[PDB]
DNA sequence: CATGCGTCAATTTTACGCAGACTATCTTTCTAGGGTTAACCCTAGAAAGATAGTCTGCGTAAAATTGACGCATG
DNA sequence: TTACGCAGACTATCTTTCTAGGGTTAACCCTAGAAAGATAGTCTGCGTAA
């Protein structure tokens, strides 16, 4: 079955549809329905303007269009005071006013606030749980992974009393919400993933690394695929217990130097030359100890074919040569997200998560798109063009409806008319036949003394005219 | 002696003069002279046209204007492919062109290439010395420091081949060029500074920390001041050497652990209760050992005559409070430069220094500006308005020279004319020479490639049209 | 006052000629970002550097376009 | 008829919290400046007059 989009994802050449696969109707309807509860709750008697109206599904799509465009322009840390400034750009004011944008960001909700106070017992993630599960479900069901998978962590930076907040040194951002994730290697596709809550996490007799590899692997259990892991996810009993009737997955990965299972032989940094390696085995698994420059050693473990080899062009053991090519799956997805991200400063952790889901949906939709286009021998566009097209496909319906107000200021009326795709009625270029003059005649607005040959026929009334009097259109037809 | 700008730059009430104050004409003249040396060598006989013309002083000013505006916005890591995309913004296209900006950016030079090959043996930093020395000189003569000074280090982040860079783990942009500097605490004004060249710096029998404090202190060795710093710069003999006749400074700072000058009295014991402190004395100097909540100690040193008592709001000794409140003197210069800054990737090292100098000049110019306006009882504008005004005052003389060419593309002419202050007396919108441009030579709706002239316009929409389409009104007007 | 043709001369439109400044997109080369077995390694995507193409002004000579008179009966 | 007053939807700018960012004594601390939140306005098009 190789790898690529599934049957229900075939022949989609429209990046709006590739995006909707991850933001289904159920997700959009829940956001609009619950958001309106806050708009009603926070409305006061003096708040009677247009700015304080409820949310429509067209408007929720448009605000998402804005988030996609800020990611493209890399200006997500710029204030709304400047983003909506007409003297610098009209790209963000033709879609929404500055004030309604600020108002909606404060009001978005993903749950029923009247149920939540008891619904939350035993689940700290409750306020965003329905949307998260609807979203993850579409990752799992829309694509077939290849032979190599990899599992690693990703952080969503956040400060602001999040009950799941973790402090993690040796990161760009020290505080945030941790997410565990599984990706298709080579083609960086998110297959699965689960937030780490840590209160609201229960693994009975199971260390976290083992727990998450087994649960993330769910869709591929029994398929004979290979998973690449760093130290957090490589316990030996994981490597051995994934080769059973249930679970048929191999493990390739690093081992912490303090594991007792590594023979002391493979730790003797004093006798080994630089560039050399040692191999040993335990039942089905192969362990290799490689010694780079002095005072360092590398421990790699794997479930693999028995043959061992060294790539003579570098002198490194093949397990290292191989490891280095699959370990980057999750991280590569993370750096792609950092180049183009929708994240904004916010005061509520559940909003931070929406931004995270948008960043992922915009990448997974690109992967489905490039497979459907390149498989037909067509050229595939870069990410920048893909996202410019989402902007127009997500905001055009809304922009068009804004023109119905009698009062839009001309700044907006003109930019919406020009940016909005210019469909022009009549451009079918096939007219209806109506009688016309086929003989030589004179201008009816000219005196008989002139007998000016008519050289035109009125656009809206087919009158015989001279260009001097009635140029193309007749005066009465203007 | 007070604190604030000096007499020579006191009655300056605008941003352009405050900026020119730091760079001066000697720097602009040297850059233009040497830049032209490369333009004349990289130009081939097949490369003709406006894009390959030499550099004028007015264009180099426009060039700085673009970098400044780029710093106001956060978009300084955008490709030149879309910073100059007129469908998103008119900010940059109205000043130059995409291609001339790329050509000039790779051609700037700050020296005489025929002389340097015999200077470079000692002057490792040659290619920027005649720009750098003048800049520092100007900084020193324009501002009077206060009683509190802070000395610390900054990295520029450039990767590539150039013996100025050094690798520093546990830092963002870990591989760049290191610069040392001294700032006036409270205004965060830069007084002095100098690069670290790795080798050839000729510090002899003196650690770099002591060496640089002494050299950087020169411009302030008048009345006595207190200088503070972290561990890199706090050797005890520095503290004592700064109190000898030729020196005027006292020192307050942290102490690196395991130094021979610190007693076992302060280093010790597991039995010291948490939250307490202990003092030891040596002639003029006071040493304090403070043990915060985590129960690990911090060592501070002071050559000041300040009282050893505790600030009873925190329980911390006053000496600790002083350090925490003064150490940010350099760090926040970098925070300001982490928000609004010019930096671009490049393959050529000396540009890293050029961009650093622009960022510094903008901050110091703002400090002088704010002081001079508030001292008159007027309002001080925020840093963002200051920067927007530098863009407007720095590029306008250049833009007026683009509107000389009979063929400048008209969409630029329309934008240039409107975003430009009116310096011409006796004119008005209804009394102008502009309407000679009404007679656009070509048809709005015909391809420009056929050069089909238009002798008519659409009455209802006021657009220029050709008879082939329509004569009186355009096809869209009816 | 109103409509059916004919005779070419005047006016306007079209088709390119010169020139000038700016613009979209291609294929190498190699830094920015960040992780981590790593004072090493990978990936993505922007600068380097070049080519062919797009708008804007101005000029001239044909080609198609009127339009000012010759009727023509009523 | 020229040109005035009304309500709709959009906009600038102030004063209070309190997060992004970095550095380091630091699982803590400090800073600038954005978001939160509210109060005054601007600019468009639809009914009246001499
Ligand atoms: Ca706001
Ligand atoms: Ca370029
Ligand atoms: Ca420091
Ligand atoms: Zn006529
Ligand atoms: Zn008509
Ligand atoms: Zn035309
Ligand atoms: Zn028109």
Biggest beta sheet summary of chain A: 9 strands, mixed
Return Rg of chain A in Å: 31 Å
Which class of secondary structure composition applies to the elements of chain A? alpha+beta
Number of distinct beta strands of chain A: 13
Largest interface: A-B, 20 and 18 residues
Cα(first) to Cα(last) distance of chain A is 65 Å
Taken in chain order, the helices and strands of chain A follow as EHHHHHHHEEEEEHEHEEEEHHHHHEE
Query: Which ligands does the model contain, each kind named once?
Result: calcium ion, zinc ion
Helix residue percentage of chain A: 25-40%
Structure annotation, total helices of chain A: 14
Dominant shape of chain A: elongated
Instruction: Please identify the oligomeric state.
Output: homodimer
% residues in beta strands of chain A: 5-15%
PDB class: dna binding protein/dna
Keywords: piggyBac, synaptic complex, hairpin DNA, transposase, DNA BINDING PROTEIN-DNA complex
Assembly: tetrameric
Entry title: Cryo-EM structure of piggyBac transposase synaptic complex with hairpin DNA (SNHP)
